[PDB]
């Protein structure tokens, strides 16, 4: 019945979400970025991207995404 599925929604499902939200909001501080190494299997550029200067990924984050030549 609707009563049972509402009981599961508020008594189990949303409490789970609240606990995982608390878990996440406790491990949410920025990780220490690793030394840049210009590995040939990463930062692939076979064709320029069709936006910006051609060299930045779509959701480029300056803090954690280095370019082929290193961190900005």
């Amino acid at each position: 019945g609707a009563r049972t599925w509402r009981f599961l929604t508020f008594g189990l499902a949303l409490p789970s979400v609240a606990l995982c939200t608390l878990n996440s909001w406790l491990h949410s501080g920025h990780r220490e970025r690793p030394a840049f190494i210009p590995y040939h299997h990463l930062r692939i550029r076979t064709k320029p991207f069709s936006w910006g200067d051609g060299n930045h990924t779509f959701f480029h984050n300056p803090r954690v995404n280095p370019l082929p030549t290193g961190y900005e």
Binding site: G1, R3, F7, G11, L12, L19
Partner: protein, 513 residues
């Protein structure tokens, strides 16, 4: 006629009565074992022998108290008597299979007493860890007899769980939803689901122990690539749910007793109480490795088991506060059953809170395998499960028998048992913090005062148990027949009189939508 009625029963009430008789006898065995423990520890030195005879007594104490006293009384006895009556059902779904759940227990008990009589007994602890429980360190039949005892008790409870779940789901009045069944009925359905899922895993683990002992398997033997710690995971995957199995029906009886003696038609926050019991049942499956904080698991695993274990305090707190809110505004009747229930609320709370201390893996390093654990579990078992049993017994004895107890004697019994259990277990906290290990026949001299006081406590509890036998005798001896019972409008189990006829609800209740 006697054989047809008592050996061939298909009647939920008579089977309930057989379980209560079995459990009461088991409680006397478990009490005697508890007094041998405390006689050994009541002065420094050795009374009986070395740790083997001592741990045979400790192991048997636990198995008898858990498998032959608490589970048969709560589930087999109160569950069979009350569940059909509380839902207006004419019997259990499988009334003949019900009788086999009962008749498996005398043989189970016989195998346990055989374990103790052959060779040097099973001095393993109730956990039966290898390699001490293996065929080198426990050569001979004792551990195999213990395993087979557990197999028969396991089948008894699995078939009983199938019976209760089916009865509670399928045999209510057609207008009655699950959200119109009494809390005791919910407490038995949830306990039955825990049994159905947990006991097969125990069965698998003790079967592996049996084959390591007799068929040259090496599940738990490093020489064959096995791991003693795998046994611990399988055992505790069952063992944590088992403690919720031991308390849940007690929570259900406490809800009924507090409601009744508060003069209320209903417990406070019914849906919260259902939510709390289902939450405890679920969380009880994902916490087992809090029994293994010293075995060498990874830190992140210890962090998870600490956190998941503490979460159980939230639903449990809702129940404690809901019991207090049921008392609030009551016309309080200070019956013996009410005294048991009020002692339950307080003493269960203390033992729950020492459980929360133990849930902290860092602190559990120092408390594990110490008397602090023994203090925790005797607050929740010897003052929680037992207080719920005694409350339920004095409340429903007149329903089952048609006779009244002497209330003054029952209040005397409560007062003696309250003093004895607190004198026994409160000082064990001090012994645990200061480092006294579990499963010791003797202790360094520093631990003498608290062990002396604890043993004196156990003798006060013995005096309560002896008086209880006399109180039951006096009730049957005097034959005061029940006339009227209050609050039948919200306590259906009383509405067919005391005792109810052999067949009740031949014509079912009328409930419209």
């Amino acid at each position: 006629m006697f054989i047809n009625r008592w050996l061939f029963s298909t009647n939920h009430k008579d089977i309930g009565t057989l379980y209560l008789l079995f459990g009461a006898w088991a409680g006397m065995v478990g009490t005697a074992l508890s007094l041998l423990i405390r006689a050994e520890l009541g002065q420094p030195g050795t009374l009986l022998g070395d740790d083997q005879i001592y741990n045979v007594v400790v192991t048997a104490h636990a198995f008898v108290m858990i498998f032959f006293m608490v589970m048969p009384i709560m589930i087999g006895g109160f569950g069979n008597w009350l569940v059909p009556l509380m839902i207006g059902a004419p019997d259990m779904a499988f009334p003949r299979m019900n009788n086999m759940s009962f008749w498996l227990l005398p043989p189970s008990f016989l195998l346990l007493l055989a374990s103790s009589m052959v060779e040097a007994g099973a001095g393993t602890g109730w956990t039966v860890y290898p390699p001490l429980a293996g065929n080198l360190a426990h050569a001979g039949a004792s551990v195999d007899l213990t395993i087979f005892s557990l197999h028969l008790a396991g089948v008894s409870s699995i078939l009983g769980a199938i019976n209760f779940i089916t009865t509670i789901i399928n045999m209510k009045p057609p207008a009655m939803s699950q959200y119109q069944t009494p809390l005791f009925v919910w407490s038995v359905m949830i306990t039955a689901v825990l049994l159905l899922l947990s006991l097969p895993v125990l069965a698998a683990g003790i079967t592996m122990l049996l084959t390591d002992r007799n068929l040259n398997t090496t599940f738990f033997d490093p020489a064959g690539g096995g791991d003693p710690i795998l046994y611990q995971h399988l055992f505790w995957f069952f063992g944590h749910p088992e403690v919720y199995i031991l308390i849940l029906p007690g929570f259900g009886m406490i809800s009924h007793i507090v409601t009744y003696y508060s003069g209320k038609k209903e417990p406070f926050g019914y849906m919260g109480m259902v939510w709390a019991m289902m939450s405890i049942g679920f969380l009880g499956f994902i916490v087992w490795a809090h029994h293994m904080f010293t075995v060498g698991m990874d830190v992140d695993t210890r962090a998870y088991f600490t956190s998941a274990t503490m979460i159980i305090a939230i639903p449990t707190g809702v129940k404690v506060f809901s019991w207090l809110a049921t008392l609030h505004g009551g016309n309080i009747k200070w019956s013996p059953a009410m005294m048991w229930a009020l002692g339950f609320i307080f003493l269960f709370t203390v033992g729950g809170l020492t459980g929360i201390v133990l849930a902290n893996s860092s602190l559990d390093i120092v408390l594990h395998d110490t008397y602090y654990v023994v203090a925790h579990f005797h607050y929740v078992l010897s003052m929680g499960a037992v207080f719920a049993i005694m409350g339920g017994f004095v409340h429903w004895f007149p329903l089952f028998s048609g006779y009244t107890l002497n209330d003054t004697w029952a209040k005397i019994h409560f007062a003696i048992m309250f003093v004895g259990v607190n004198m026994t277990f409160f000082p064990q906290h001090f012994l645990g913090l200061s480092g006294m290990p579990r499963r010791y026949s003797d202790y360094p001299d520093a631990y003498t005062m608290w062990n002396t006081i604890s043993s004196m406590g156990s003798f006060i509890s013995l005096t309560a148990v002896m008086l209880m036998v006399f109180i039951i005798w006096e009730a049957f001896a005097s034959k005061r027949e029940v006339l009227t019972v209050d609050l039948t409008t919200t306590n259906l189990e009383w509405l067919n009189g005391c005792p109810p006829p052999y067949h009740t609800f031949e014509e079912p209740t009328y409930v419209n939508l």
